[model samples]
Target: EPLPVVDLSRLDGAEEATKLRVALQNWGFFLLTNHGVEASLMDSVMNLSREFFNQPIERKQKFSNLIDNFQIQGYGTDRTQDQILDWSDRLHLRVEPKEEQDLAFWPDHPESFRDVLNKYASGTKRIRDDIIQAMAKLLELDEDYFLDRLNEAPAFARFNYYPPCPRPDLVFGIRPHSDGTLLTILLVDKDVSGLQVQRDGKWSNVEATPHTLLINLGDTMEVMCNGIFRSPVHRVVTNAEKERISLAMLYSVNDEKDIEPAAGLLENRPARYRKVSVEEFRAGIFGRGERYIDSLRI
Candidate 1:
C-alpha cells in the first residue's frame, strides 16, 4: 500500500485530524502538501543546491571532514572502505540553536546560499514545531509536551546529490536505514524519483510530487511514543540517466536532553526503550556500530 498524504491546511478539521492519527499509527510516514512554505522559496533553495553541487570536486572538499571523526555536521562523502559505498555526495549543516552554528563550513561560492538556506531552515523549523504539537495532541498528551521538552532542539539540513551511475542496478544512492532524528522533513527532487520505503515486507516507491514535503517519524519518536509509531526503513536507488537531489531537514532533541516514553502512555505497559540522552543514543550507534533504534531496546 502507498503511504498516506495529508494537507496541512486541513489539519484543523476533525476528519483530517482523524486521518492524520490513523496514518501516523499505521505508516509513521506521509507526504505533506499545502504546508504553507512559499513555492518560490522552495524553487530558489533547490536551484542554489544544484549550483553548489555543480562546483568542482576540489571546491566541495574544503568543507569535508574525515567520516571517522564523528563530526557529522559538514560537507563530505562517506568513507567506509569495508562496506559498499553510496553513490552520493552531501553538504550537511546544523541550523538550530543559533549559537551552536558553525558557519566556517557553510558554502560561500554561491553568494545567495547562506541567505536562502537560512530562510528555508526557518520555514522547516516552524513546520517541525507544528508537527510535534499535533502529534502530542493525537497521543492524548499535553499539546506542548513535546515542544516543551524539545524547545531548544537541534535541527540539521543536508543537501544530498546522487549522480547518475552507469550501472544503476548494481548500486544504491543510499543504503536501507531509518533516520536518527525525532522526525525528518524532506524536499525531494520533483523531476526524479528514487526514494522507497519498506512496508509489509515489501518495498514501494515514493513518487515525488511538486511542492510537497515527505515527513517520516524517526527512532527518537518511536521511543517517546512508546513504540506506538514506527521508524520506517527507506533507501534511495541509483538512476542510469538522471541524477537526483533532495534536502532533508532532520529535527532532534539536544545532546543533553534525555528522552523516554510519556508517563500516561506507560501506565499499563512496560517501557520498550530505556531512558537516555540523545548524545548517549548517538554514541551507541556511531561508536559501537549498533543498529539505530535496536541499540536502545531495553
Candidate 2:
C-alpha cells in the first residue's frame, strides 16, 4: 500500500483526525496534503536549497558546522569519530524560543537564504503544532497536552542535499534510524522520490507531491504517547540519476522539561518507557547506535 494520506484541509472533524490517529499508530509516517505551507513558498525554499548546494565549495565551507568541535547548525556532513558517512550534505538552523536564534553559521551568499529560511521555518511550525493538538484530542487528552511542552521549545530546520551517485547500491543517502525529535515536518523535492519508511522488515516507498508535507513521529513522541504511536525507522536512498533535496522542521520538548509518558495515557496501561530529558535523548542517539529508544524501555 502507498503511504497513508491525510488532507490537512479536512482536519476539522472526527474523520480527518481519525485518519491521522490511525496513521500515527500504524505507519508512524504519512503524506499530508493542503498542509497550508503555500506551494510557491515551498518552491522558493526548495529553490534556495539547490542554490546553496550549487555554490562554490569555498563559499559553502564558510558556513561549516565543524567549527571547534561539532555544532549542530551550519552547512556540513555528519560523521562519527570513525565511521561511514551519509551520501549527502546538510545545513541545520534553529528557529524557535526566539532568544536561541543565532546567525553565525547561516549561509551568507544567497542573499535570500536567511530570509527565506525564516519564512519557511516559522510557517511550517503551525503544521507541527496542529498535528500535536490533533493527536492530544484524538487520545482524549488535553488539547494543549503536548503543545504546552513544545510551545517554548526548540524548533529547527535541517536541509539535506543527496547527490546522485554512480554506485547508489553501495552507499545509502542516510542510514536507517528514527528521529530524536518529537515530530518532523518535511518538504521533499517535487521531482524526486527517495524517502522510504520501513515496515515488516521491508522498506516501502513514500511518495511526495507539490504542496504536501510528510509528517513523521520520533522517539520523544513515542515516550509521551506511551508507545501508542511509534517513532518510525526510516531512511533515504540515493538516486542513481538525480539529486534529491528535503527540508525538515523538527519540534521537541524543551530541554528544561522531562519527557515522560502523558498522564492520561498511562492510567489504562503501564508505562512502556522511562523518563528522559530532550537533550539526553538526542545526544544518546548522536553517536554509534542501535535504535536508541530500546534503551529507554522499562
Candidate 3:
C-alpha cells in the first residue's frame, strides 16, 4: 500500500491542510504529488543520476565524501568498521549559505549535473518554503513561525545509489537513523521500492510513485514542535535484483540558532525538550552514540 498522499495542488484547501497536519503529527512522512516541480526536470535529474552512478569507479571517485578521517561534500559510502555496513554510494553536496559551496567536490563529467542539480535544488527549495508556511499556519502561529529560525540555514543534497545485493537480508543501503535537519524532501527511484520506515515499533516498505516526492520530518522538527510532530526512523534496504537510487534535499535550522519549542506552544503545555543550539546538538547528541532525537527529550 502507499503512504498517505498529500496533493500539493489542493494544498490551500482546508481538507488538504487537515490531511497534511495529520500526516505530520502521526506518520511524520507523506507522499507529495503535483508538487510543482517540473516533471521534465525531475526526470532529467533522476535519469542523469543513473549516468553519474554508472560511471567508472575512477570517475565517480572524483567527488568522494569519504576522506581518511571525516566526510563532507563528495561521492562516497560511509560506515563503521563493523557489521551492518551501509551499501549505498552517494554524492553529497551543500547548497545553502551560498558562500559555502565547494565546487571542487562536484563532478563535472556529466556537464549537466551542476546545471540540472541547481534547477532541481531550486525547485525543492520552493516546496520546502510552502510546507513550512503550511505547518506554521496549521500550528496556529504566524506563517513565519518556523521560517524565522530556518532562514540562512544549511541545505544539503544527497544523490543515493543502492546497488543490488545477493543477500538482501544480510545488507542494507543504509541503516536506520533520523535525519538531523528541520525536514527532508526526497525523490526516490520510481521503479523500485527501497525505502522503509519504522512506525509503532514495526517497519513498513514505502512505495515510490511516479513524479512524486517524499517529505519526512527530521530531529530538529521534533525538538521545534515539542514532540507533537515526530521525525521517524527510516532506512533503505537492499534490492534483490534491481538497483535503486534517490535524491534527498535536507533543509536544516541555522547552525547558530538555538532550537526549542516555540513559546506559544508551551503556554499550557510543558516543554518536552531542552533547548540547544545546532552546534551543541551535533556535538553532544549525535556524537555520543545515543539515540539522536531521544537524547534531547526531557
Candidate 4:
C-alpha cells in the first residue's frame, strides 16, 4: 500500500473535508499539495545543503552535536548507536537561539553555516506558519490557533542530507520515531524515493510528489486534538546509488509552564494526556528509556 497523498487545496468544503479530517485523525501524517511555498526556495535550500555538508571534515565537525547530551546530534556514524544508522548527515538549527544558548553544552557552529542556516530557518518557518494555519482550519479551529500555540516556543529546523549508501536494504535515512513537537513540516527531496511510513501495520512508501510538503502531527498535537491528531512513526530508506536532500522544520513549544491538553481539546474528556512541562517531556523522551510512557504522567 502507498502512503496517503492529501491535497491541501481541497481542505475547504465537503468535497474532500472528511478525507482531510480522517488523514489527521488516523495517520497524523499526510503529503500536502498546493501548499503555496515557492520552488526556487526549495532549489536554493537543496543547493545550500550540498555546499554545507560537503565541506571539510574539520568544518563539519565545528557544528558537531553540541546540544546532543545523548550524542545523537552530530555526524553520527552508521551502525554505531542504533540498530541501523540511516546513511545520512544532518545539521540541526534551533529557532530560539536563546534556548540553544541556555544549554550547557552544544556544537561550535561555523560562521558560514550559521549564516545560511539562519536564512533557511526563517524562510522555512514562514512555510510552517502558513501550513499550521491551514491545518488548524482543517481541524475546525481558528486560523492562528496552532500557529499561536507554537510562537515564542522553541522550534527547530534540520538540514538532513541522505548520501547514497552501498547497501540500501541494510540502512535507513532515519529511524521510525514520532516527532516530539506540535507539528513537522517537511520539504522532501524531489525525484528521490524511499520515504516510508507504517500503514495497517506494514511499511508503505510515500512517494516524493512535486510541489508538496509532508506534514506530520506530533506528540503535542495529539494532546491538542485529544487523540484526533496522532504522531506518525515514519522512516526513510535511501537508494544505494542516489543521494537525496531534505529539510524538516519542527514546530514546538518552550514554555515549561504552559504544556499539555488545551482547553478546546479537554472540553470533552477528563484529560486523556497528563499535564507536563516541555522540559520534562523532552527529558522523558530523550533521557530515560524503559520508563518512558510512565514518565508522561508521573
Candidate 5:
C-alpha cells in the first residue's frame, strides 16, 4: 500500500487535520512536503554528510563514543553482536536542551558541519512543534497540552552512512526497530532508497523523494495517546554497489516527566501502558535492549 502524503502548508484547515489523524492512526507514518525548510539547506546538509563519511576511517574514529560514556552520543559504529552488526557508521549528537550540547565528540572535518546542522535542526524543531499542536487539536485537547509537557524536551540528530557491501542481502544497514522518540523526522538519501516499513505482515519500501521528509510517530506517542497513534517498525537495507546516507532528527519529552497514556484519552478506556519516568523508560530500551512498546504492555 502507498504511504499517506500530507502537505504541511494546508495543516491549518480541518480537512488537513483530519487527514493527519487518519494517517497517524492507520500508517503511523507519512510523507511530508512543503515543510518550509529550504532545499539549499537540505542539500548542504546532505553534501556535508557525504564529505564527513568519506573521510578515512582512522580520522572518523577520533570522535568515536560507542562505549564507556554516560550518554550514547558520538560518532561510532553499532557495537551489537557481529551477527546483527549493521553495515553503517553513524555520527550522533544531541541538538536540543542547549546545555547538553557536547562539542567534544562532534566532527570538524566537514567545516560547515556544526553550522549547517544547527540551522537545519532549528527549522526542523519548529516544524515538529507545529505538528504536535495540530495533533493536540485532533485529540480534542488544548492546543498546547502536549507542547507544554515538552518545554525543555530533548532532540537528537543522527547522520548515517551505509557503506556499499559486497553482499547486501546478507546484512542490513540498520536492524528492524521502532523509534523511541515522540516523533522522528527523516531526510532519506535522495538518490537511493533503502528505508522500509512493516505493514500488515508485509514490508514496503519507502521511496525518498527530493526535498520531502518522512515523519513517523514513535513509542512515546503511542504511550501518550493510549495507542491511538502507532510506532511502526522500520529497517534500512544496504546496497551492493552504492553507498546511502540519511539524517534522522528524534524529538522527545523531558527525561524527568512521567510517561503514560494521557488523562484526556482515558475517560472510559483502560490504560494500555504503564507509566514510567522518561529516564527509566529509556534505560529499559537502550540499556537492556528491550522493545519500547512491548515493555509497556498492559
Candidate 6:
C-alpha cells in the first residue's frame, strides 16, 4: 500500500488541515517537516544515545531494572522476556518525574547522557504541545483538550539502537504493535531506513525523510476519538547493512486511571473501542509479558 503524503507545510492552511484530519482518522501516521526543531539539537540527542549505548556492560547495567514496574527509567532488551524476541535494545526515560521521585530509576551513565536526554526532552515538550494544539484544531476541539486530561501526566522518551545483522530477512528490529499512549513523536536516525507500517491492509516502508518528524496517534487516541483516529500497527525491520536509531516520545496520562472516549465523539456515535482500565491493560501487556495488539483491550 502506498503511504499518503500530507505536506505538513499546509498544516496552518485549509488543505493541510483537511489532510491532517484524514491522516489522524484513517492511518494515525503522518510525516512532518519544517517543524522548527533545530537540526543541531536533534543531532546531539542522537549522538548522546550512541555514546550511552557504547558504555561498558558494567556502566550500562548500573541502571538496569530487574523489576518491570512502571515503564519508566533505565534500560531493557527485546529478548529479556520469554515472549518472541524483538531485535532491538532500548533505553527508556520519563521526561516527567515519578510521584515518589526515585532517582534510582534514572540513568546516570556516561554523565552526558542525562544532560542531553533532559535537554532533548525539554525541547520536544514544547514542540509536542504545539502539535497537540494543531491536532485539537484539526479535530474541531478546544486547544486544551489534550492537556486538560492530565492529573499526573507522564511523558516517555525512548532511545532505540538496532545493530547491523548478517541476515536481515530472518529478523526484525521490533515487532508489530501499537502504542498505548495518546500520541507519539518520532525522530528517525539519519541515512538509515527500517520503519514500516501496515497500511491499506498491506505493509509499506516508512522512510525517514530528512529533517522530518513522524507523528502518529496511539491507542489512547483511539479511545478518545471513539476510533475516529487510528493507532496503526507498525514495526521496524532489521537490515544486514544498516543499523537504525530512533527517538520516540510518548505522551500519556499518568496514575491509575482508565482512558475513555471523549464526550464530543461519544455524543455522536457508539464507542468503537471497549472500556479498559489501565490496570487491566497493563496486566495483559506487562504481566503476561505479551507484546502484541492483544495487550490492549480497546
For TM-score, candidate 1 versus 5, the one ahead is 5
Task: Report residue 20 deviation for candidate 2 (angstroms).
Answer: 0.9
The better-scoring model by TM-score among 2 and 4 is 2
lDDT scores of the candidates, listed in order: 0.80, 0.81, 0.81, 0.64, 0.83, 0.70
Prediction 3 TM-score vs. true: 0.93
Writing each residue's lDDT as its tens digit, candidate 6 over 125-200 gives 7766766777777667887877666546788778887888777773455767778777788888764567778877
For candidate 2, the per-residue lDDT at 157 reads 83
Query: What TM-score goes with each of the models?
Result: 0.92, 0.94, 0.93, 0.79, 0.93, 0.85
lDDT of 2 by residue, 107-212 (tens): 8767898888888887777888888888888878978887778767887788988888888863566778898888899898864668788887878888876678
- The regions of model 6 sitting more than 4 angstroms off are 1-10, 68-72, 78-84, 98-102, 105-109, 285-298
Q: What's the ranking of the predictions by lDDT, best on top?
A: 5, 3, 2, 1, 6, 4
- lDDT string for model 1 (20-99, tens) is 88877766678888898999989888888899999998988888754534547777765354234577888888888778
| Global lDDT of model 2 | 0.81
In the range 245-285, model 3's lDDT, one tens digit per residue, is 78999888876668888777895799999998767776653
Query: How much lDDT does candidate 1 score?
Result: 0.80
